[PDB]
Structures are given as C-alpha cells and as structure tokens.
C-alpha cells in the first residue's frame, strides 16, 4: 500500500484559469516546486494579485496535486488540483477582517506587505470564515519554470477576453 | 466533469493513522458534516474532540477531502485515500499552540470557553504549518451517528487498541 510518487514535473510550469461554482474567476501559475503567482478576476477580492507566494505541493495521484499556503493577511488556503479531469477544489480559511473588508486585500500584495500585516495584527481574526467550492478549469498552458512574465500586471490591465480563453 | 458527491464510502469510517513524524491520530466520520477525533502521540497526544463540524467532498474512488477550523484557531485540511491506505494532512496552528501544545490537551467539549480565551489572547502569527503524509494502519465501519466509537481519553483505552492493523 505505497504513498504516491512525489515527482512534481506534471504541475510545475502549469498556468490555469478556473471558475468556482459561485462564479468567482481565479488564475494560478506554479512558478516552481514551492512558489506560485496568482491573480483574482472576480468575486469579493477581484483585482487582488500576488507574486512569489511560498507554497507546499504534494502529488495525490495521476494529474492530481495538493497546494497549501498561508498569506500575510492570515488567510490559509489548501487546493486539490485535478489537471486530468479539469476541476479543482478550494478551501480558503480567511480571517474575519478579510470577510468584512475584502476590498482592503485588493492590491498588488508585493507592494503592500506591511499594510497587510498591520490589518492582520489589528484583526479581528476569529472566527475564521471558510469557503469550500469546486471550480471548473477552463484554460491550461505550460509556461516553464521561474517565468516572471506570466502574471506581471493587475487583472484590470489585461485584454477583456483574457479570462474567457479556453482549450 | 467534477466527481460524484456521494459520501456513503466515507461516512461511518473509523481510522487510525501515523504521520511520517510518528504522531498517531484517530478519526471517526460520524455523518456528512461531523467527526469525532482522538490524538494518541506527538505534541498534543491526549487531546480528543466530539461533534467537530467539518466539510467533506469526494475527490475520486475511495479519496475524500475533510476540512474544518477548531476553537483554538487551528485550521485542518486532510486528503484521505482509503483504497491506498494513506492520508495527507495540512495543520495550520497559531503561534500560542506551537509554544504551549499542553494547553490544548483536553476533552475539548468540556473546555470550549478556555480554548476561545487562549485563542483570543494569542499570540497568533506567524502560523506554524504541518504538511505530512500518514499511513492508515486500521479502518472499520461503525455506521452513522454512533456516540460510542470515541467516548473516552486515549489514556483510558485498552493497551493494544492503537496498535491493531487490518
């Protein structure tokens, strides 16, 4: 009864666009074994985007990966990504203050890390608000490792049909 | 093409598992959205919980995700593979739990207010994150809403209970 092989070559370099069952459109790029960039297009935190988010990735089975991390806002995330079947499951544990004021996290976070930690330390943190939703993966491409051009602007500054592309 | 969300393959399941760091945990899926659990070893060995609200989804054949938050502020997301007898755990705990794990070693149901006081006191940040694979050493079906599966402290169990295999 072996635990699955931990080769991550099937996930690193992957760039995906996905729509949660509640309509929220998210974007992910797996920069390397332990780093992602992401960009949020709609829902309460549409406009939020992040580079060089440290992440822990494990392989669950064929084309199936788990991606988990914590954010400077205090938010915790664990994703299950099925590339083969083109779906994803997201658990987002956000702090109470992020639930109350999602607008305050709508930034290029890399230019505002101190502000995020100030809002986090101010709270309130508890109780945490939990989102569990399935998403459809509408788009997948391979952009290779450590490519800083994949996610390099606010979602508002992209062409209008960028988020709507399919394969 | 998202997977069918029939949870009958996970509800009623009772499992004992050992993380790669040797920590022995025990889980009972009481119903679609509730677990009891009992921790036997590692920093919070002695801790046990009844009627933990939980969100469960089916990922594939014999593969389930179980996620919840605790009155301590701890967040948990498990991937359970019953077919291949392994489990992957992500545990996000507050700085104060990392510093004083002994303070969470209780029958939590009799100490909910104390846990929330310790949580609101902090410190909270940075969070400490555990990602570990576990081997599932034992599985049985105990059916739905069975309050007898996990009804005492791990210290009060028969000596061979956590060592059984199948």
Numbering used by the authors:
A (entry chain B): 24 to 190
B (entry chain A): 25 to 190
Q: What does the report in the manuscript say about this coordinate set?
A:
Enzymatic decarboxylation of biobased hydroxycinnamic acids gives access to phenolic styrenes for adhesive production. To date, several PADs have been biochemically analyzed and structurally characterized. PADs adopt the lipocalin fold, and the core of the protein is formed by two mutually perpendicular β-sheets. In solution, a homodimer is formed by two monomers that are related by an improper 2-fold axis. In this study, we used ancestral sequence reconstruction to generate thermostable decarboxylases.
To gain a better understanding based on their activity and stability, we determined the structures of N31, N55, and N134 via X-ray crystallography. The models for the remaining ancestors were predicted using AlphaFold 2.41 N31, N55, and N134 were crystallized with one, two, and three homodimers in the asymmetric unit at a resolution of 3.1, 1.6, and 2.5 Å, respectively. For a given PAD, the monomers were found to be highly similar to a root-mean-square deviation (RMSD) of below 0.3 if aligned. Also, the overall structures of the PADs were found to be conserved, leading to an RMSD below 1 Å if aligned to BsPAD. The highest structural divergence was found in the C- and N-terminal regions. The C-terminal part (depicted in red) shows some structural and sequential diversity. N55 and N134 harbor an N-terminal loop (depicted in blue) absent in N31 and BsPAD that contributes to some extent to the dimerization (compare also Figure S4). All ancestors showed a highly conserved active site architecture with identical catalytic machinery.
